[PDB]
Write an enzyme that holds these catalytic residues in place. Structure first.
Site, PDB file in Angstrom:
ATOM      1  N   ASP A   1       4.675  -0.195  -7.584  1.00 51.51           N
ATOM      2  CA  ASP A   1       5.106   1.123  -7.087  1.00 51.51           C
ATOM      3  C   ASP A   1       6.340   1.538  -7.605  1.00 51.51           C
ATOM      4  OD1 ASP A   1       5.334   3.773  -6.195  1.00 51.51           O
ATOM      5  OD2 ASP A   1       5.056   3.270  -4.067  1.00 51.51           O
ATOM      6  N   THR A   2       6.416   2.229  -8.836  1.00 52.18           N
ATOM      7  CA  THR A   2       7.876   2.695  -9.362  1.00 52.18           C
ATOM      8  C   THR A   2       8.527   3.734  -8.379  1.00 52.18           C
ATOM      9  OG1 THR A   2       6.903   4.292 -10.582  1.00 52.18           O
ATOM     10  CG2 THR A   2       7.116   2.237 -11.825  1.00 52.18           C
ATOM     11  N   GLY A   3       7.718   4.593  -7.637  1.00 50.78           N
ATOM     12  CA  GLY A   3       8.497   5.286  -6.839  1.00 50.78           C
ATOM     13  C   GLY A   3       9.042   4.691  -5.342  1.00 50.78           C
TER      14      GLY A   3
HETATM   15  C1  LIG Z   1      -5.661   4.621   1.534  1.00 52.29           C
HETATM   16  C2  LIG Z   1      -4.270   5.200   1.640  1.00 52.29           C
HETATM   17  O1  LIG Z   1      -3.941   5.558   3.094  1.00 52.29           O
HETATM   18  P1  LIG Z   1      -3.018   6.982   3.307  1.00 52.29           P
HETATM   19  O2  LIG Z   1      -3.770   8.133   3.066  1.00 52.29           O
HETATM   20  C3  LIG Z   1      -1.645   6.864   2.350  1.00 52.29           C
HETATM   21  O3  LIG Z   1      -1.204   5.574   2.280  1.00 52.29           O
HETATM   22  C4  LIG Z   1      -0.288   5.463   0.932  1.00 52.29           C
HETATM   23  C5  LIG Z   1      -0.422   5.073  -0.278  1.00 52.29           C
HETATM   24  C6  LIG Z   1       0.635   4.753  -1.432  1.00 52.29           C
HETATM   25  C7  LIG Z   1       2.066   4.917  -0.859  1.00 52.29           C
HETATM   26  C8  LIG Z   1       3.369   4.714  -2.063  1.00 52.29           C
HETATM   27  C9  LIG Z   1       3.775   6.035  -1.788  1.00 52.29           C
HETATM   28  N1  LIG Z   1       3.088   7.095  -2.391  1.00 52.29           N
HETATM   29  C10 LIG Z   1       2.620   8.268  -1.690  1.00 52.29           C
HETATM   30  O4  LIG Z   1       3.247   8.370  -0.821  1.00 52.29           O
HETATM   31  O5  LIG Z   1       1.858   9.044  -2.406  1.00 52.29           O
HETATM   32  C11 LIG Z   1       1.185  10.145  -1.895  1.00 52.29           C
HETATM   33  C12 LIG Z   1       0.988  11.375  -2.704  1.00 52.29           C
HETATM   34  O6  LIG Z   1      -0.263  10.687  -3.519  1.00 52.29           O
HETATM   35  C13 LIG Z   1      -1.241  10.447  -2.671  1.00 52.29           C
HETATM   36  O7  LIG Z   1      -1.644   8.790  -2.908  1.00 52.29           O
HETATM   37  C14 LIG Z   1      -0.989   8.108  -2.321  1.00 52.29           C
HETATM   38  C15 LIG Z   1      -0.551   8.708  -1.041  1.00 52.29           C
HETATM   39  C16 LIG Z   1      -0.403   9.832  -1.311  1.00 52.29           C
HETATM   40  C17 LIG Z   1       5.316   5.883  -2.982  1.00 52.29           C
HETATM   41  O8  LIG Z   1       4.580   5.597  -4.117  1.00 52.29           O
HETATM   42  C18 LIG Z   1       6.272   5.356  -2.185  1.00 52.29           C
HETATM   43  N2  LIG Z   1       7.134   5.920  -1.303  1.00 52.29           N
HETATM   44  C19 LIG Z   1       8.165   6.883  -1.578  1.00 52.29           C
HETATM   45  C20 LIG Z   1       7.927   8.349  -2.263  1.00 52.29           C
HETATM   46  C21 LIG Z   1       6.970   9.037  -1.441  1.00 52.29           C
HETATM   47  C22 LIG Z   1       9.172   8.855  -2.754  1.00 52.29           C
HETATM   48  C23 LIG Z   1      10.182   8.865  -1.448  1.00 52.29           C
HETATM   49  S1  LIG Z   1       6.849   5.453   0.073  1.00 52.29           S
HETATM   50  O9  LIG Z   1       5.395   4.288   0.086  1.00 52.29           O
HETATM   51  O10 LIG Z   1       6.945   6.460   1.181  1.00 52.29           O
HETATM   52  C24 LIG Z   1       8.011   4.104   0.158  1.00 52.29           C
HETATM   53  C25 LIG Z   1       8.010   2.754   0.020  1.00 52.29           C
HETATM   54  C26 LIG Z   1       9.299   1.899   0.081  1.00 52.29           C
HETATM   55  C27 LIG Z   1      10.691   2.664   0.323  1.00 52.29           C
HETATM   56  N3  LIG Z   1      11.996   1.857   0.585  1.00 52.29           N
HETATM   57  C28 LIG Z   1      13.083   3.065   1.050  1.00 52.29           C
HETATM   58  S2  LIG Z   1      12.132   4.244   1.066  1.00 52.29           S
HETATM   59  C29 LIG Z   1      10.629   3.907   0.823  1.00 52.29           C
HETATM   60  C30 LIG Z   1       9.575   4.598   0.631  1.00 52.29           C
HETATM   61  C31 LIG Z   1       2.132   5.237   0.562  1.00 52.29           C
HETATM   62  C32 LIG Z   1       1.163   5.480   1.491  1.00 52.29           C
HETATM   63  O11 LIG Z   1      -2.541   6.977   5.135  1.00 52.29           O
HETATM   64  C33 LIG Z   1      -1.878   8.307   5.287  1.00 52.29           C
HETATM   65  C34 LIG Z   1      -1.292   7.617   6.906  1.00 52.29           C
END
Ligand SMILES: CCOP(=O)(COc1ccc(C[C@H](NC(=O)O[C@H]2CO[C@H]3OCC[C@H]32)[C@H](O)CN(C[C@@H](C)CC)S(=O)(=O)c2ccc3ncsc3c2)cc1)OCC
Lengths: 99, 99
Positions: free
Chosen positions: A25-27
């Protein structure tokens, strides 16, 4: 290898002698893994994303193997819905985004 | 270009005629932008992140240019902590992960 993004970029990792599936995860600034009972000292931390914050345990200098590539750094452990490998480790395995 | 991950992979995007900064995020299935006015019809939708679920406005078939590369696809608008380009559009510009 080269990973396309048609599907979630999931890879097998090895941490604490256990195999798990994690998203490259690049984000993600840091690496966040589902709850597991790691030994050693840790520090509390809160990390935020869509939906708000979760409380995690920060462990330092943890060794992780990502598709054969070895990496060592900070791992956050907590009630995350998915295992995420973040930039802090992806930089160590030479990972880049190409388009 | 080849983008390394020592810094956040932030890039300029062009959407609805306005420039903005966004994070290329291989862990996001979907593209989610902070509150803004976007020309077009939209439907209410929910998306889930690390911290739970949020309500967003779903705009379909939106034109967006990401470092000069054109994409046309779904854009979600709502209270995300940062603008994120997700896999639905990264695949359009031919983005891959390589390590
Ligand atoms: C089967 C799924 O279950 P689910 O629906 C969702 O689960 C998830 C699936 C993937 C991810 C990874 C997250 N992607 C995302 O949020 O993507 C959304 C938008 O696209 C959709 O697809 C995926 C979800 C939807 C990002 O990549 C990374 N994030 C930061 C980003 C938002 C920028 C601030 S981070 O994870 O918040 C994070 C990690 C380390 C870190 N260190 C310091 S801060 C900090 C913050 C999280 C949860 O459960 C719901 C309760």
């Amino acid at each position: 290898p080269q990973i396309t993004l048609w599907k979630r970029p999931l890879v097998t990792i090895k941490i604490g002698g256990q195999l798990k599936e994690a998203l490259l995860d690049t984000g993600a600034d840091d690496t966040v893994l589902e709850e597991m009972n790691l030994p050693g000292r840790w520090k509390p931390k809160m990390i935020g994303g869509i939906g708000g914050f979760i409380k995690v345990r920060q462990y330092d200098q943890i060794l992780i193997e990502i598709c054969g590539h070895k990496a060592i750094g900070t791992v956050l452990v907590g009630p995350t819905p998915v295992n995420v490998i973040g930039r802090n480790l992806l930089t160590q395995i030479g990972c880049t985004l190409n388009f």
